[PDB]
Design a protein around this ligand. Structure first.
Ligand SMILES: *[C@@H]1O[C@H](CO)[C@@H](O[C@@H]2O[C@H](CO)[C@@H](O[C@@H]3O[C@H](CO)[C@@H](O)[C@H](O[C@H]4O[C@H](CO)[C@@H](O)[C@H](O)[C@@H]4O)[C@@H]3O)[C@H](O)[C@H]2NC(C)=O)[C@H](O)[C@H]1NC(C)=O
Ligand SMILES: *[C@@H]1O[C@H](CO)[C@@H](O[C@@H]2O[C@H](CO)[C@@H](O[C@@H]3O[C@H](CO)[C@@H](O)[C@H](O[C@H]4O[C@H](CO)[C@@H](O)[C@H](O)[C@@H]4O)[C@@H]3O)[C@H](O)[C@H]2NC(C)=O)[C@H](O)[C@H]1NC(C)=O
Ligand SMILES: *[C@@H]1O[C@H](CO)[C@@H](O[C@@H]2O[C@H](CO)[C@@H](O)[C@H](O)[C@H]2NC(C)=O)[C@H](O)[C@H]1NC(C)=O
Ligand SMILES: *[C@@H]1O[C@H](CO)[C@@H](O[C@@H]2O[C@H](CO)[C@@H](O)[C@H](O)[C@H]2NC(C)=O)[C@H](O)[C@H]1NC(C)=O
Ligand SMILES: *[C@@H]1O[C@H](CO)[C@@H](O)[C@H](O)[C@H]1NC(C)=O
Ligand SMILES: *[C@@H]1O[C@H](CO)[C@@H](O)[C@H](O)[C@H]1NC(C)=O
Ligand SMILES: CN1[C@H](CO)[C@H](O)[C@H](O)[C@H]1CN
Ligand SMILES: CN1[C@H](CO)[C@H](O)[C@H](O)[C@H]1CN
Lengths: 390, 392
């Protein structure tokens, strides 16, 4: 989408995975979907270094709406859980130097059963712009036809454009199209800043593996379409929650950098381990994700329960990730000719290699003839950056 | 097995899950099955508090053997990887105050292809006793008949007895019966100190869930068989390795305490996080596992992606574990009448409740009519101890 936005993958926080559709503010006041939750997250995004690391979009997912529209047919936030309204919340978020994302659905209802935007695309776009919204996530539930799905996603893209406000447009169009028809990613990129391809992530290693496997399976279709203004979205970062071991968290962070993925944390910034925070705020890895060239990486090799992915970066540099998919035993040795990396140019005639994950360590100079050996933890990833000696 | 051993579930360390059958000492010297690995592991078991917490048996699994027996038809350790021999290794381990476990197979070969014990049961038992072995894990590969399987397990039990040396006898008999016929656990208990029931664990939450679900599904068949001298073995602890989140590690530790499981760590004690170490050395949870009453716990309830397990303990106390099996979202609330716990006895007329996991905190006095409310992390467990009292 040529709206000047998402020139690098969008970074921020999104409530869905960790907080879901909790409406019980009476019994769960600190975890229900409320304006207080988002205010606390914005406060911590400033005070705990998230904004400085690049996480900029504080995003509301489903279940913010009142059950019905206003008299003029406009969406309204729930009067009890969002008593001051979205425009005020956006004002607060902006006062923190942050941007505010909101959620709507292309069909007749949101996935959780709240008002859909079908028949109100222009009204809803102008409402979001008036509120000061900076990002829209657009879900695909309750849509009776593929033609209505495509038409709705394109119409909402155009309506957002016509408001004149810069609004990042995040689409679930491919995900809801895939079971029925192969998506045309040239068109999707024309209308969306990033797009969800695969099933919702949850707090499990199984979900990480599924997302990676589906991405590599479909890489010939989706890798080349991604770039500044339009990204593949493999769904939220779940680092800092409950289901991932440390090495599985490392794998998610490294591979979301390789994939030029949007980095939307879905966690509780009020209760997050120092290790999870240091990983999520890892300047070198974020710099890979945010590389201005914006070329998505890909799986180079798979075999012997290992995977090798790589990503071309600005200025003759490359990122390389090695995943150990064997879920038994100890760290396993993997060796690869450096001439096989970066299409044969990364280390011709030599490259300096720096390991970034799981720990940062300079490995030294590797000649074009060299072989790189590493030991990779089960379900973990070794992430390296290769700099051509010029 | 009425040999005076395993009056509580055996505790120690077993190499299989973490180190497997790595024979490449040239390229993977820190991971290969060698006498130096076991010597260093024994040193750390002493120096890092493992022995003090109760982990006493340093156990060799498969792939310690030479490819053939010696001229006298006796098993030998690999001359390159175990040049000083099992007897010296046992002397070293004993000098550290620890006990040494070894591995053999009921059939013609071990599962990795090394010499089996069929036809040599008495020779092999007396060999292990001469070496100073204190525990034998007995695998079931390469056995042509169920009759040979059962006869071999019983025969090796008797041969170990005949040596006169106290040797804990760990059997895989039930697991190897399952494809053909349901096991008779009365017989197995008569011959074994503990027995593996289910597939090998690996370094994954999937494996933990599978073991728990198979145990609860089959609990009416196996729970009452367990007791002092004979335990169900749901396989090694994998806390301290790579595949389990903190909450999943908590779940394994809590539930292995509930199940009166042998506690055989399979990890690398040279590279273990302080959090994993504190969990594995948790004195209160180990005390639950080692409860002298020796009655295995069970699943009390399951539903809405929650599980409630409980275990009766000595002196009218109970351990209660609540598992959140929903793998999305945040900590979920669970409420239960304390009268529903511990068969209605734990809190009659009252109980003092102490949360032990994921953090230790006294919760207070609960009357028989009261309700306990807790929040459980996704894939995590809350473990509580209930102490019966009349005080309030
Ligand atoms: C509604 O849709 C229209 C059409 O799709 C869209 O207009 C487009 O806006 C983008 C960004 O604002 C334009 O791209 C710019 O083109 C100008 C040409 O003068 C360039 O100078 C810009 O360069 C930027 O990036 C440079 C590096 O590449 C930097 O030097 C610097 O940061 C510049 O800002 C940039 O390429 C695009 O040309 C127009 N297209 C048309 C047809 O007008 C508009 O933004 C949309 N409006 C909303 C509210 O979404
Ligand atoms: C070879 O096998 C034989 C039997 O097949 C086995 O001897 C049996 O087991 C133990 C040996 O320690 C005996 O049990 C003891 O019996 C006396 C009887 O008065 C009791 O006082 C003992 O009680 C103490 O120890 C118990 C722990 O086991 C506690 O429960 C108790 O509170 C006391 O502390 C104990 O029960 C058993 O009687 C014999 N049975 C026979 C001989 O028929 C022998 O040990 C095996 N040898 C080897 C080397 O394994
Ligand atoms: C996928 O969609 C794109 C855009 O909707 C199609 O590309 C356009 O094709 C028309 C002709 O049908 C050309 O006039 C445009 O110039 C093309 N646009 C771009 C940006 O190239 C493309 O044909 C579609 N592909 C399939 C297989 O349907
Ligand atoms: C180990 O192998 C030997 C040789 O095959 C087995 O002995 C055979 O046993 C089968 C039935 O069990 C008989 O039909 C053969 O006549 C036996 N052959 C010999 C040479 O004795 C032995 O049973 C095997 N042991 C185990 C535990 O499977
Ligand atoms: C919404 O419902 C109406 C009436 O049932 C239907 O005509 C319309 O196509 C629906 N819209 C979508 C996007 O499914
Ligand atoms: C199991 O074995 C024991 C000991 O041999 C025997 O007493 C019992 O009857 C057996 N049970 C069944 C069901 O065969
Ligand atoms: C079901 N919806 C949820 C909101 O209800 C999340 O936004 C999820 O991303 C989407 C399905 N892909
Ligand atoms: C395959 N053997 C392995 C030794 O080779 C482990 O001892 C495992 O316990 C058993 C299978 N249940």
């Amino acid at each position: 989408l040529d709206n000047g936005l998402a020139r690098t993958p969008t970074m921020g926080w999104l409530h869905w995975e960790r907080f879901m559709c909790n409406l019980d503010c009476q019994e769960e006041p600190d975890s229900c979907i409320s304006e207080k939750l988002f205010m606390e997250m914005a406060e911590l995004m400033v005070s705990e270094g998230w904004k400085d690391a690049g996480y900029e979009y504080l995003c509301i997912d489903d279940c913010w709406m009142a059950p019905q529209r206003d008299s003029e047919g406009r969406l309204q936030a729930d009067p009890q859980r969002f008593p001051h309204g979205i425009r005020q919340l956006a004002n607060y978020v902006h006062s923190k130097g942050l941007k505010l994302g909101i959620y709507a659905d292309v069909g007749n209802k949101t996935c959780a059963g709240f008002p859909g935007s079908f028949g109100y695309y222009d009204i809803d776009a102008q409402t979001f712009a008036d509120w000061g919204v900076d990002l829209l996530k657009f879900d695909g539930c309750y849509c009776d036809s593929l033609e209505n799905l495509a038409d709705g996603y394109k119409h909402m893209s155009l309506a957002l454009n016509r408001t004149g406000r810069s609004i990042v447009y995040s689409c679930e169009w491919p995900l809801y199209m895939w079971p029925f028809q192969k998506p045309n990613y040239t068109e999707i990129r024309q209308y969306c800043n990033h797009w969800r391809n695969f099933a919702d992530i949850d707090d499990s290693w199984k979900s990480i593996k599924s997302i990676l496997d589906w991405t590599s399976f479909n890489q010939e279709r989706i890798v080349d379409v991604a770039g500044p203004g339009g990204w593949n979205d493999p769904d939220m970062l779940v680092i800092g929650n409950f289901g991932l071991s440390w090495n599985q968290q490392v794998t998610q962070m490294a591979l979301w950098a390789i994939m030029a993925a949007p980095l939307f944390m879905s966690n509780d910034l009020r209760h997050i381990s120092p290790q999870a925070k240091a990983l999520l705020q890892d300047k070198d890895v974020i710099a890979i994700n945010q590389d201005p060239l914006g070329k998505q990486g890909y799986q180079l090799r798979q075999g012997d329960n290992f995977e090798v992915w790589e990503r071309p970066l600005s200025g003759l540099a490359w990122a390389v990730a090695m995943i150990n998919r064997q879920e038994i035993g100890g760290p396993r040795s993997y060796t690869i000719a450096v001439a096989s990396l970066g299409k044969g140019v990364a280390c011709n005639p030599a490259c300096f290699i720096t390991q970034l994950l799981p720990v940062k360590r300079k490995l030294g100079f590797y000649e074009w003839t060299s072989r790189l050996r590493s030991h990779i933890n089960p379900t973990g990833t070794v992430l390296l950056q290769l700099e051509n000696t010029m």
